[PDB]
């Protein structure tokens, strides 16, 4: 017997997708202090 | 379901540890339900282990459940668990004391800001130690050697805002890795040879290639030595004696954690779990006799030369381990069978007791000394103090040996085994062993009744709040009686089981070379950093430059003056006919 | 099973990037166009899962999402995609990291219309490297991520941007031509003019001809997977980059050189691989030793991890040139492990630079007192790189050590001097990582706290990307059959094809 990757990748994928869509809203420090400013490495 | 006791403190570490990284505003407020959470799952982990210990001896002995780990063509890796009396006893030596540290640190850390992170460390620290004691393979002792070594890096570097514990925690991990470097070569050396990873396979497969001659016994001599490189680099010996000085540069129950139940659960277990590897090579048993006797000399002779009870008691862990390699160095492991379980029963009862001495002195420690954690500066812990100094009496005296108490049967058979194995090298140990009982009595006299300085009677988070260097009366912690009610009777309940050669658990459970190299590897690092690049960045200095200066060189072929352009047109006409008739 | 699955997965983020110039509401910085890239990034990864959990059908060799169209019959090139067990983990890995590389690209408001274009064009172009079973589409897809990564470095990057991006594109284009030289050499060998990767594998090439093509591919793939004499573009192009550009370069782009070593140097060219295998494991050993010593001798934090990425690459090169089913399975696992591990460190290096703004590591110290969650995630990803068991950095290195010194292809005195020297990186990796861990966060003495590093925080979105990277890092480290089950049908055929040329 062996645990297959397909029933647990298919299970975690809608968990994965609707979490990135949620965690984009919850964020800090990239909108208020932001001394990097418009750049990303300046 | 005997595989649940590794993962149950591990599940306690992932549940709590995710609560800090994702729910910091709530878990820091829930400091008390978190601390009792893993202390429940560790108490659950004892409730599956004492049944696995008591109801396995004199009963259903053997068990080997395996699960395939990795696979290839005729190359399978398995990882599971065994329930052996050499394994089930090793649970109770660690699953009890892991419950003991989290009870003792609950009373020690009360105003600590990083309170929840500490129990999340011991959750993963205990689960890593509970993992390799049931491990049937050399791979599964190499799954949990670094997992123990990682929390040993994490517990020393617990107060990360202290640079004295920062560089101490890194070098404790590196010195643990140079032993893990040998253990990794120890696996793949004995897997190229035998082809198995279980010792039930290597009990037969190893000696079939030594007495016959497909591999030379000198080739396997370094291989069994390379496995032994693990437990010697984890105990601060003459390769790198830098590990155990770091044991008292962080929190106080870390000496009970990493200096009491790690060298006995990894250094002593692995040399005992690998019985049919060391017994079949006489060129290996003479080296665990050599290196085993010198660490009893190196641990003791630096311990008298000490002005503190912090390192000198940690140096006692090096020297008392020197009489544990001789538990295997003479072959007769039954003399090490009594000090297998009692090296954390009434030895750690002092290692929790000595931690409460320097804790109830001034309060919080600044970096080293501000909680009065130094010897030859204060005294009077036996004149007027709590019960924490009374376990400093029975937890110190019985190691040299008292005929009513236990420990008298600990230091008679370890010389009684070398009297029947190799009595020509006994004098080098007894010149130490007669003196290691002497200076350990000086640990009693210079820490219980001596020259006092101030009133160090309380404030180990046991009296009232705001008691910085102000402790007139005494105050016993509520988490001190249940330590003194469990492991005290267990120091007598195990003092009758497995004490002699014919007993219950005796047959039923039968220096600066790294700093010379870290400064050595740093020398060749700065030289190699610009060596092989500049022979190809010289090509960049060649090819990326000769392309541009050819284009700045062929630029002057165009110079205006189209009469010159009519030369190169007509020299090409003159040049292509002689190109084509030749 | 009739729908074009890999052709959609390749061409969706390329086509969807063309609607990026037409996104409305330019309210200063680009907010909806940032969400649109995560929209067509996540639903593109959902198709990689949907084509996997339904129409992959593992434990069989050969391609399983095969679509061989017709593009130019006059040349003989076909749009031939197909995913076997060497392609499908890295195809799944490419969709996974690039969904997070969009999600870590959220402070990027310099030129957000140009940025998420070139990141989605590098999303379709990176999957197109592992998926295509052709040569002139393989050289197309290999050079497809040439301009959308020059412009990612040369605009969003540190100082010495333009030196780093120009050195990159000259090493990359100047060695991609050897894919065209060798890929045309094999397709015109003999009488058949086929450019398919499966047809060119079954062709019989001479041993003198194969040693030219193997040296042709090794300069082509020793640059991208940085074999250590051709590695100098890597610490420049990674020393001046941002965190979302990092996870495509370290996480994905270095694996295309390692993936193509198993395709076009082991399958197609086994007889020269029997002759050029001992030079690879010496080069793989001196890849680990050199990069770990050069990581310890460096002060730049972004260059310290950049050189650290060269060291874990060396375990792939040992595992390929070992002729073992466990050596090859530790070589593909080292590509997927370092792809997830190196993405997590490089995201946190870009997270620490967004607060401290130094990257000097002698101008830092005591950062972990100010920010606590980035420090908590920096060690959990640094300990992942240390080959610490319970995480996939160990089992990938463990299979390489075991799979090397059990092989019936080398001598015993050669196998001893490799596994001894390749295990110095077991010691050397806690040297530079834990010291850099010590010389940044572990400290009472803080910085100036005035000019730079005036702020300190730790966002919950940045915690989520490290959390998503540690689930396959730990989950393969606790059960490596969650990924070996994809390999062993194909790597069982790769080594057995290379087993026939081993008596030499």
């Amino acid at each position: 017997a062996v645990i297959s990757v397909k029933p647990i990748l298919l299970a975690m994928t809608p968990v994965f997708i609707l979490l990135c869509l949620f965690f984009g809203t919850r964020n800090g420090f990239y909108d208020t202090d932001q001394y990097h400013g418009n750049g990303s490495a300046h | 379901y005997a595989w649940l006791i590794p993962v149950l403190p591990l599940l306690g570490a992932l549940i709590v540890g995710f609560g800090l990284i994702a729910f910091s505003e709530t878990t820091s407020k829930l400091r008390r339900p978190s601390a009792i959470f893993i202390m429940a799952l560790m108490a659950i982990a004892m409730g599956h282990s004492l049944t696995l210990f008591w109801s396995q001896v004199q009963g259903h002995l053997p068990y080997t459940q395996m699960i395939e780990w990795a696979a290839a063509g005729n190359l399978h890796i398995a990882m599971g668990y065994v329930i052996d009396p050499l394994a089930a006893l090793m649970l109770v030596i660690v699953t009890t004391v892991a419950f003991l540290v989290m009870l003792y640190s609950d009373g020690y850390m009360a105003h600590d800001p990083g309170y929840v992170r500490f129990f999340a460390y011991l959750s993963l620290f205990g689960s890593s130690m509970l993992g390799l004691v049931v491990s049937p393979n050399l791979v599964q002792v190499y799954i949990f050697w670094e997992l123990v070594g990682m929390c040993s890096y994490l517990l020393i570097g617990f107060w990360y805002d202290r640079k004295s514990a920062a560089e101490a925690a890194q070098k404790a991990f590196v010195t643990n890795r140079v032993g893990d470097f040998g253990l990794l070569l120890g696996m793949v050396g004995l897997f190229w040879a035998t082809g198995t990873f279980d010792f039930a396979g290597m009990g037969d497969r190893l000696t079939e290639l030594v007495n016959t001659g497909l591999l030379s016994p000198s080739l396997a001599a370094i291989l069994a030595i390379l496995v032994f490189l693990g437990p010697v680099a984890k105990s601060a010996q003459f390769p790198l004696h830098v590990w155990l000085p770091d044991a008292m540069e962080g929190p106080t129950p870390i000496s009970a954690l990493i200096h009491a139940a790690t060298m006995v659960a990894a250094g002593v277990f692995l040399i005992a779990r690998m019985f049919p590897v060391f017994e079949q090579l006489p060129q290996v048993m003479t080296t665990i006799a050599w290196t085993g006797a010198f660490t009893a000399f190196m641990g003791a002779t630096i311990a008298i030369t000490q002005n503190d009870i912090k390192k000198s008691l940690a140096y006692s862990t090096i020297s008392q381990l020197g009489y544990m390699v001789m538990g295997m160095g003479v072959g007769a492991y039954s003399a090490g069978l009594f000090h297998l379980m009692t090296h954390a029963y009434f030895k750690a009862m002092l290692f929790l007791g000595s931690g409460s001495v320097i804790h109830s002195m001034e309060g919080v420690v600044g970096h080293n000394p501000d909680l009065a954690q130094d010897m030859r500066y204060m005294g009077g812990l036996r004149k007027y103090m709590p019960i924490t100094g009374a376990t400093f009496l029975v937890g110190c005296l019985a190691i040299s040996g008292v005929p009513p108490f236990a420990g008298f049967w600990s230091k008679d058979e370890i010389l009684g085994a070398v009297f029947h194995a190799n009595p020509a090298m006994w004098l080098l140990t007894w010149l130490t062993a007669g003196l290691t009982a002497f200076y350990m009595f000086r640990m009693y006299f210079m820490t219980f009744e001596g020259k006092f300085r101030n009133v160090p009677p309380e404030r180990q988070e046991h009296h009232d709040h705001h008691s910085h260097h102000a402790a007139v009366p005494h105050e016993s912690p509520w988490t001190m009686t249940l330590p003194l009610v469990v492991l005290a009777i267990p120091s007598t309940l195990i003092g009758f089981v497995g004490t002699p050669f014919n007993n219950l658990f005796e047959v039923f459970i039968h220096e600066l070379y790294e700093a010379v190299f870290i400064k050595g590897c740093r020398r060749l690092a700065r030289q190699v950093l610009e060596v092989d690049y500049n022979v190809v960045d010289g090509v960049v200095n060649l090819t990326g430059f000769v392309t541009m200066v050819t284009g700045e060189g062929l630029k002057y072929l165009q110079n205006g003056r189209a009469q010159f352009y009519a030369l190169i047109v007509l020299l090409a006409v003159l040049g292509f006919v002689i190109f084509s008739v030749q | 099973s009739t729908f074009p699955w890999l052709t959609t997965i390749i061409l969706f983020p390329i086509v969807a990037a063309l609607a990026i110039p037409f996104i409305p509401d330019p309210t200063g910085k680009g907010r909806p166009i940032r969400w649109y890239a995560l929209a067509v990034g996540l639903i593109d990864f959902a198709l990689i899962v949907y084509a996997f959990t339904n129409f992959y059908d593992l434990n069989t060799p050969g391609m399983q999402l095969w679509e061989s169209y017709d593009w130019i019959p006059e040349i003989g090139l076909r749009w031939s995609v197909g995913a076997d067990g060497l392609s499908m983990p890295l195809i799944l890995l490419t969709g996974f990291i690039t969904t997070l590389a969009i999600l870590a690209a959220w402070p990027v408001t310099l030129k957000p219309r140009l940025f998420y274009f070139l990141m989605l064009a590098m999303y379709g172009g990176q999957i197109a490297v592992f998926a295509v079973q052709d040569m002139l589409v393989f050289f197309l897809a290999w050079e497809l991520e040439l301009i959308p990564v020059y412009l990612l470095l040369a605009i969003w990057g540190g100082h010495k941007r333009q030196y780093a991006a120009t050195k990159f594109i000259l090493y990359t284009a100047g060695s991609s031509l050897f894919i065209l030289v060798a890929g045309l050499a094999m397709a015109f060998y003999g009488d058949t003019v086929s450019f398919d990767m499966q047809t060119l594998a079954a062709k019989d090439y001479a041993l003198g001809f194969q040693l030219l093509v193997y040296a042709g591919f090794l300069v082509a793939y020793g640059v991208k997977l940085p074999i250590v004499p051709l590695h100098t573009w890597l610490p420049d192009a990674h020393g001046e980059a941002t965190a979302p550009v990092h996870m495509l370069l370290a996480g994905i782009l270095l694996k295309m050189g390692g993936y193509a070593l198993i395709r076009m140097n082991v399958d197609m060219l086994p007889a020269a691989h029997a002759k050029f295998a001992p030079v690879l494991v010496i080069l793989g050993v001196v890849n680990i030793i050199y990069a770990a010593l050069t990581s310890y001798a460096q002060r730049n934090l972004k260059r310290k991890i950049a050189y650290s990425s060269i060291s874990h690459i060396g375990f792939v090169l040992i595992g390929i040139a070992s002729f073992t089913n466990l050596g090859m399975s530790g070589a593909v696992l080292q590509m997927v492990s370092h792809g997830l591990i190196g993405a997590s460190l490089f995201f946190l290096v870009g997270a620490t630079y967004d607060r401290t703004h130094t990257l000097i590591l002698e101008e830092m110290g005591g950062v972990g007192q100010k920010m606590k969650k980035i420090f908590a995630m920096f060690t959990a990803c640094s300990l992942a790189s240390l080959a610490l068991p319970g995480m996939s950095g160990f089992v990938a290195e463990l299979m390489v050590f075991i799979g090397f010194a059990t092989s019936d292809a080398y001598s015993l005195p050669f196998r001893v001097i490799v596994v001894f020297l390749a295990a110095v990186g077991v010691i050397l990796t806690p040297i530079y990582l834990l010291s850099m861990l010590r010389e940044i966060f572990y400290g009472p003495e803080n910085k100036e706290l005035v000019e730079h590093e005036a702020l300190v925080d730790a966002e919950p979105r940045e915690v989520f990307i490290i959390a998503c990277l540690l689930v396959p890092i730990i989950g393969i480290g606790l059960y490596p059959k969650l990924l070996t089950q994809i390999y062993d049908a194909t790597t069982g055929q790769v080594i057995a094809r290379a087993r026939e040329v081993l008596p030499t």
Side-chain angles (χ1 to χ4, degrees), chain A residues 1-33 35-37 39 41-42, chain B residues 1-24 26-28 30-57 59-78 80-162 164-179 181-197 199-233 235-239 242-245 247-248 250-256 258 260-301 303-309 312-358 363 366 369 372 379-380 386-419 421-444 450 456-457 470-471 473 477-484 488 490 495 498 500 515 520 525 535-581, chain C residues 1-24 26 28 30-56 58-142 144 146-190 192-239 241-353 355-361 364-371 373-396 398-407 409-444 446 449-450 452 454 458 460-461 463-499 501-503:
Chain A
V2 51
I3 300 169
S4 199
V5 60
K6 292 175 174 201
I8 58 184
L9 185 57
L10 167 57
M12 268 188 299
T13 299
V15 171
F16 170 63
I17 288 164
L18 317 173
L19 271 173
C20 314
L21 298 163
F22 160 69
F23 267 102
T25 63
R26 277 193 185 170
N27 50 2
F29 176 68
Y30 282 131
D31 50 358
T32 164
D33 305 314
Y35 296 137
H36 52 277
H42 283 306
Chain B
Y1 300 147
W3 51 266
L4 209 61
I5 89 185
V7 293
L8 266 163
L10 182 53
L11 188 145
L14 307 183
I15 281 300
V16 163
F18 186 76
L20 274 83
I21 197 57
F23 306 116
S24 49
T26 82
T27 304
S28 296
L30 265 75
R31 55 183 295 277
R32 198 60 168 187
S34 85
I36 72 165
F37 174 70
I38 306 103
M39 271 155 46
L41 316 183
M42 202 63 94
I44 282 291
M46 272 175 304
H48 281 209
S49 87
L50 319 173
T51 64
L52 265 190
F53 170 66
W54 177 244
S55 278
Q56 199 256 10
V57 306
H60 170 54
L61 273 299
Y63 206 99
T64 310
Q65 182 146 22
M66 297 310 294
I67 294 93
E68 202 163 28
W69 174 262
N74 196 77
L75 271 183
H76 316 289
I77 314 296
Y81 59 97
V82 298
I83 306 308
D84 199 80
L86 297 199
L89 166 59
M90 282 291 331
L91 309 164
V92 183
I93 311 151
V94 62
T95 190
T96 49
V97 306
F99 177 77
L100 261 288
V101 181
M102 306 192 290
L103 260 290
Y104 171 65
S105 44
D106 199 5
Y108 179 71
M109 325 182 93
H111 56 269
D112 192 277
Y115 181 69
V116 195
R117 186 177 68 254
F118 196 82
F119 285 90
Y121 285 151
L122 303 152
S123 318
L124 171 57
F125 176 73
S127 157
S128 44
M129 205 81 75
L130 270 51
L132 81 158
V133 291
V134 307
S135 54
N137 279 14
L138 267 166
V139 192
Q140 208 168 334
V141 313
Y142 205 55
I143 297 311
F144 295 92
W145 201 276
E146 308 85 332
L147 283 172
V148 161
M150 177 203 45
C151 316
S152 82
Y153 150 75
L154 287 176
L155 281 173
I156 299 170
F158 172 73
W159 286 313
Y160 47 87
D161 52 355
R162 202 140 92 233
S164 64
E167 48 197 62
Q170 170 194 11
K171 186 51 72 176
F173 192 83
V174 184
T175 322
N176 220 334
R177 277 300 271 258
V178 306
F181 157 71
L183 185 47
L184 175 144
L185 280 181
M187 292 183 314
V188 309
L190 307 169
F191 191 71
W192 172 90
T194 76
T196 64
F197 272 130
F199 310 114
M202 276 187 286
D204 169 72
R205 281 292 306 170
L206 196 148
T207 193
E208 210 174 21
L209 322 170
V210 187
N211 65 77
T212 41
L214 308 97
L215 67 90
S216 91
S218 315
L219 170 145
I222 191 55
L223 268 186
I225 278 297
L226 269 180
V227 190
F228 191 51
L229 193 62
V232 291
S235 294
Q237 305 188 4
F238 72 99
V242 65
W243 207 101
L244 272 297
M248 310 277 269
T252 40
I254 302 310
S255 157
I258 81 169
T262 311
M263 46 214 64
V264 74
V268 171
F269 157 74
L270 176 68
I271 69 183
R273 187 43 87 190
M274 296 176 34
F275 182 73
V277 174
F278 303 135
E279 68 161 353
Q280 298 163 349
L281 279 77
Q283 40 263 55
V284 174
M285 303 179 257
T286 175
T287 41
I288 68 177
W290 195 96
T291 47
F294 183 54
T295 177
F297 195 81
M298 200 173 176
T301 43
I304 288 94
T305 78
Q306 271 298 123
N307 289 174
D308 206 304
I309 64 169
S312 52
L313 202 53
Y315 291 161
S316 89
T317 69
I318 319 168
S319 44
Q320 199 49 256
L321 197 86
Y323 307 104
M324 300 314 277
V325 195
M326 318 321 275
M328 196 52 180
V330 309
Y333 69 103
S334 200
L337 268 181
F338 193 29
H339 209 65
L340 180 65
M341 77 278 281
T342 66
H343 212 176
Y345 284 167
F346 45 92
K347 297 298 296 292
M349 264 296 212
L350 208 62
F351 298 150
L352 61 89
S354 45
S356 44
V357 167
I358 66 155
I387 209 61
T388 78
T391 187
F392 208 73
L393 262 56
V394 65
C396 168
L397 172 83
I399 298 95
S400 68
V402 193
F405 292 96
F408 201 49
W409 268 247
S410 300
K411 280 180 182 177
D412 46 16
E413 303 291 331
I414 60 149
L415 299 200
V418 78
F419 285 176
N422 189 272
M425 295 276 112
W426 164 69
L427 194 136
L428 299 103
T429 78
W430 183 243
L431 76 92
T432 81
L435 206 166
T436 69
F438 284 168
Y439 91 104
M440 199 205 189
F441 282 159
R442 211 181 56 84
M443 301 280 88
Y444 159 72
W478 201 58
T479 50
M480 197 85 258
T481 166
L482 68 169
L484 268 296
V535 83
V536 200
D537 267 356
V539 169
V540 167
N541 204 351
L542 207 170
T543 298
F545 191 74
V546 300
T547 297
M548 290 274 288
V549 307
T550 313
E552 297 269 347
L554 287 162
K555 187 214 291 178
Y556 309 132
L557 196 57
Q558 275 257 318
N559 50 343
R561 58 175 205 93
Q563 276 79 33
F564 172 68
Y565 300 166
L567 274 174
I568 313 296
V569 165
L570 282 158
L571 284 177
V573 176
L574 262 187
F576 277 132
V577 190
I578 71 183
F579 199 85
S580 295
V581 192
Chain C
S1 159
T2 80
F3 184 73
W5 281 116
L6 286 184
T7 304
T8 315
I9 283 159
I10 287 171
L11 290 168
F12 185 49
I14 294 182
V15 159
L18 309 180
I20 280 197
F22 310 133
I23 284 303
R31 303 311 196 198
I33 186 169
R34 149 184 93 174
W35 273 96
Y36 172 67
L38 195 71
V40 302
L42 279 166
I43 73 178
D44 189 83
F45 172 61
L47 301 191
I48 315 174
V49 175
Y50 195 91
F52 181 70
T53 71
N54 303 328
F55 320 112
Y56 184 64
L58 53 88
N59 59 65
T60 178
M63 314 311 132
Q64 284 101 19
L65 278 304
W66 177 260
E67 293 134 31
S68 176
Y69 296 154
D70 216 348
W71 200 355
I72 295 166
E74 290 81 3
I75 294 177
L77 60 89
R78 289 179 175 269
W79 177 258
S80 290
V81 294
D84 65 85
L86 289 161
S87 315
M88 203 65 208
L90 305 153
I91 282 169
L92 276 155
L93 178 89
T94 312
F96 179 54
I97 305 184
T98 322
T99 39
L100 312 167
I102 293 289
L103 194 55
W106 277 50
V108 189
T109 77
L110 196 143
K111 287 164 190 183
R113 304 195 145 274
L114 189 55
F115 190 84
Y116 298 105
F117 175 78
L118 308 152
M119 196 152 275
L120 284 166
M122 216 172 150
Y123 185 16
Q126 265 163 4
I127 305 174
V129 177
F130 316 105
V132 295
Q133 314 285 335
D134 204 23
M135 286 322 191
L136 313 177
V137 182
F138 187 74
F139 170 61
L140 197 156
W142 196 276
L144 211 57
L146 190 46
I147 293 303
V149 47
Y150 178 86
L151 302 185
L152 276 186
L153 296 177
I155 305 178
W156 308 269
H159 293 249
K160 317 282 291 179
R161 246 176 304 126
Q162 197 50 238
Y163 164 69
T166 320
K167 189 169 180 176
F168 160 77
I169 194 181
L170 265 65
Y171 272 93
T172 306
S175 65
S176 283
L177 65 101
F178 286 106
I179 310 170
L180 189 64
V181 163
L184 282 160
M186 290 178 304
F188 283 98
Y189 194 85
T192 320
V193 72
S194 192
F195 273 91
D196 272 316
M197 279 179 155
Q198 285 168 314
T199 308
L200 280 189
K203 207 186 284 187
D204 166 84
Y205 316 98
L207 194 40
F209 172 78
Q210 271 187 27
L211 285 170
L212 266 75
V213 183
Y214 203 102
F217 279 132
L218 207 54
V219 58
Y221 303 144
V223 171
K224 281 294 289 317
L225 173 133
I227 297 181
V228 80
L230 305 104
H231 81 283
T232 318
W233 72 277
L234 194 73
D236 288 302
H238 291 202
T242 78
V245 192
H246 258 307
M247 302 182 286
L248 308 183
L249 267 63
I252 313 299
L253 282 201
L254 263 66
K255 317 299 171 290
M256 323 205 309
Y259 150 81
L261 275 169
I262 320 180
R263 309 291 281 183
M264 302 146 95
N265 269 20
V266 191
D267 304 2
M268 299 171 191
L269 275 76
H273 186 50
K275 313 304 286 176
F276 275 3
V279 61
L280 282 195
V281 292
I282 301 154
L283 274 173
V285 156
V286 300
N287 213 2
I288 301 168
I289 302 298
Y290 183 90
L293 292 183
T294 323
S295 298
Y296 195 40
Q298 272 202 332
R299 319 256 60 85
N300 200 345
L301 158 71
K302 197 171 266 177
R303 286 184 183 260
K304 200 163 191 162
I305 312 288
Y307 261 111
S308 157
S309 158
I310 311 177
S311 158
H312 312 315
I313 278 302
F315 285 112
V316 193
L317 196 58
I318 297 173
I320 298 174
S322 54
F323 306 98
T324 320
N325 287 258
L326 202 50
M328 183 59 76
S329 199
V332 193
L333 189 42
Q334 193 48 75
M335 299 197 291
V336 191
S337 155
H338 170 246
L340 303 152
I341 280 172
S344 51
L345 282 175
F346 270 134
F347 169 59
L348 290 161
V349 172
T352 301
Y353 174 72
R355 275 101 183 160
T356 78
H357 293 242
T358 59
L359 272 189
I360 302 310
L361 176 137
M364 269 190 300
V367 159
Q369 266 295 113
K370 288 303 161 58
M371 56 201 78
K373 300 198 165 199
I374 309 189
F375 176 40
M377 294 175 310
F378 211 88
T379 77
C381 300
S382 200
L383 291 154
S385 306
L386 299 190
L388 190 143
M391 277 178 288
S392 43
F394 171 77
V395 57
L398 175 75
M399 292 167 179
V400 163
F401 280 132
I402 293 173
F404 193 78
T406 65
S407 83
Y410 304 117
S411 86
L412 182 50
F414 184 61
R415 281 186 279 181
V416 167
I417 201 72
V418 165
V419 190
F420 183 78
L421 265 294
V424 191
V426 173
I427 303 175
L428 283 172
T429 320
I431 302 307
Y432 58 89
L433 279 197
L434 292 203
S435 46
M436 157 212 83
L437 203 48
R438 192 197 72 239
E439 296 137 9
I440 289 178
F441 311 104
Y442 286 92
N446 304 338
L449 272 296
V450 171
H452 321 91
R461 181 192 52 86
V463 168
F464 169 69
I465 306 173
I466 293 301
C468 276
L469 281 164
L470 283 185
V471 187
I473 279 168
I474 298 175
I476 301 165
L478 305 181
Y479 200 46
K481 294 187 83 54
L482 288 200
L483 193 59
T484 310
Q485 60 190 273
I486 307 167
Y487 303 168
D488 56 321
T490 317
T491 66
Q493 286 302 125
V494 162
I495 304 299
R497 178 183 309 186
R499 202 70 65 87
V501 303
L502 259 187

